[PDB]
Amino acid sequence: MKYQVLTVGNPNSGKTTLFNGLTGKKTGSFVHAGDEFSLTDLPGIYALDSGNDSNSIDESIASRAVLTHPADVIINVVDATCLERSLYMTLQLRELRRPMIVVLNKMDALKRERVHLDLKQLEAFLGCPVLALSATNKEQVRRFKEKLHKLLVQGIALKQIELHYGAEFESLIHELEPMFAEQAVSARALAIRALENDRLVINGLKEAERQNVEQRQHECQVDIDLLVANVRYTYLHELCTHVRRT
Ligand SMILES: Nc1nc2c(ncn2[C@@H]2O[C@H](COP(=O)(O)OP(=O)(O)O)[C@@H](O)[C@H]2O)c(=O)[nH]1
Ligand SMILES: [Cl-]
Ligand SMILES: [Cl-]
């Protein structure tokens, strides 16, 4: 009866459009088929990260909320025109294993560029529901409400992405997953972030557990940021060639 919906995506992905279309950093609600929907439009971010460099306070707030804000579902709004760039965050959302839908927006611009994308198999690799849309189109957004409501009542079925970082990094992950098994979010996902040196995860930790984590970042023989960038990029690129066709 009362659902919390987070809107998350890159800047210029269409978030504010789809938020305004549904409801009538911005907050709002609507009703559909006898249930209530509290919507939140989180600021545009490109990764689930904050901290010293990621100066913008807005980005930290978005990162923090995705990490900790209550949510029945996170709507990942993805600009279908720059598909590969946007999907990097999508991967990280998937590693959180929070309930989530991908919304390919700006589909109108894509079909006038003679690009057809295999949303069926795109769904197969992300392992979460994938929806196509043009948020400026009133009819499709209303159709989107019915689709979203149905999913929330039916429950969202998720299979986790086959994302593998190589034996060493995988070992460091399974070393740190212990101290995250209680959290609302995948211990693996938080373990990966801790090796990635995410201020949000790390500062949450006990003084002891904090000095565990960076003991592992010295253990790693390759640059952690170099490894995750390559692995996610490779995965992304293979997927795009499989799903994008002309
Ligand atoms: N062609 C096309 N343009 C869109 C669509 N949705 C949004 N836009 C445009 O892309 C820009 C996105 O703005 P906005 O919704 O604020 O993106 P935000 O930065 O994520 O909040 C706006 O100028 C929109 O008019 C769409 O489905 N198709
Ligand atoms: Cl209910
Ligand atoms: Cl692309």
Residue numbers in the entry: 1 to 24, 39 to 260
Can you provide the manuscript's text about this entry?
For this bacterium, Feo is the primary system that transports Fe2+ into the cytosol. FeoA and FeoC are known to be small (ca. 7–10 kDa) cytosolic proteins, while FeoB is a large (ca. 80–100 kDa) polytopic transmembrane protein that contains an N-terminal soluble G-protein-like domain termed NFeoB. The status of GTP and GDP bound to the NFeoB region is hypothesized to control the opening and closing of the FeoB pore and therefore the translocation of Fe2+ into the bacterial cytosol.
Partial sequence alignments revealed that the position analogous to Asn150 within the G5 motif of the VcNFeoB NTPase domain is highly variable for NFeoBs known to be NTPases, while this same position is an invariant Thr residue for NFeoBs known to be strict GTPases. To test the structural basis of this hypothesis, we expressed, purified, and crystallized the G5 motif N150T variant of VcNFeoB(His)6 in the presence of GDP. The crystals diffracted to 2.9 Å resolution, and initial analysis revealed one apo VcNFeoB(His)6 NTPase domain and one GDP-bound VcNFeoB(His)6 NTPase domain both within the asymmetric unit. This hetero-oligomerization is likely crystallization induced based on our in-solution studies. Omit maps confirmed that substantial density was present and consistent with GDP in one, but not both, molecules within the asymmetric unit, allowing us to visualize a direct comparison between the apo and the GDP-bound N150T variant at the same resolution. Interestingly, the presence of Thr in position 150 affects the hydrogen bonding pattern surrounding the guanine nucleobase both directly and indirectly. First, the Thr hydroxyl moiety now makes a new hydrogen bond with position N1 along the purine ring. Second, the removal of Asn150 releases Asp122 to tighten and extend its hydrogen bonds with positions N1 and the H2N-C1 group. However, by comparison to the WT protein, the N150T variant appears to have two key additional hydrogen bonds surrounding the guanine purine that could affect nucleotide stability and may afford the discrimination of GTP relative to other NTPs. Our structure of N150T VcNFeoB(His)6 revealed increased H-bonding to the nucleobase due to the presence of Thr150 in the G5 motif, but this modification alone did not dramatically alter the binding affinity between NFeoB and GDP and only modestly increased the binding affinity between NFeoB and GMP-PNP.
